[PDB]
Amino acid sequence: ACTKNAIAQTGFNKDKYFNGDVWYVTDYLDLEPDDVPKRYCAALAAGTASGKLKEALYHYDPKTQDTFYDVSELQVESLGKYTANFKKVDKNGNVKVAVTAGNYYTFTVMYADDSSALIHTCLHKGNKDLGDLYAVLNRNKDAAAGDKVKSAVSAATLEFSKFISTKENNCAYDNDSLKSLLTK
């Protein structure tokens, strides 16, 4: 189960974050480890498509090769805090698992600037019991975390030394598919 009410960034700039471009996860913190594998790759695109707030997700396990994409419609709870359904799709947006009640995640942008961000997410999926996940994002898949986002980690009363990096997994991303999935 999740335990955190993450606080959104003061003065969060939604149009800058949701500008249609890709964000790479560079570092993550799972509060119930063994939720996820230690070695992992993830990225998303975030934007408005025909008036609708959307995210597209990509997950890849670099050892098992498990791979999946998702498309989500985001509903606003408050500035910087969203509830997102998800549908599992192939890379072209063809539906594999339809949207359903109880399959959703919350998404809070705790810090963002033009190049980096800190988010919290609470995933709900059927029967599963999942805990809080934090992620450090960058526009550059290889960027070491800078002082602005590391300070935000500290201000959230978290220790960046606890986060696991994704940078040594040889992850390669199809950014074109993530961008096109925003419309699907």
Curated annotation (Swiss-Prot):
Q: Name one GO biological process term.
A: vasodilation
User: What does the function comment of this entry state?
Assistant: Heme-based protein that delivers nitric oxide gas (NO) to the victim while feeding, resulting in vasodilation and inhibition of platelet aggregation. Reversibly binds nitric oxide (NO). Also binds tightly to histamine, which is released by the host to induce wound healing. NO release is pH dependent and linked to loop dynamics.
EC number(s) from the headed UniProt entry: 1.7.6.1
Quote the protein name from its UniProt record.
Nitrophorin-4
Among Pfam families, the record links this protein to: Nitrophorin
The record's similarity note reads: Belongs to the calycin superfamily. Nitrophorin family.
Q: Which cystines does this chain contain?
A: 2-122, 41-171
Q: What class of enzyme is it?
A: oxidoreductase
Localisation per UniProt entry: Secreted
Q: Which GO terms describe its molecular function?
A: histamine binding; metal ion binding; nitric oxide binding; oxidoreductase activity
* UniProt: heme binding residues: 59
Q: Which classification does the entry list for the species? A: Eukaryota, Metazoa, Ecdysozoa, Arthropoda, Hexapoda
Cofactor(s) needed: heme b
Entry keyword annotation includes Plastid = no
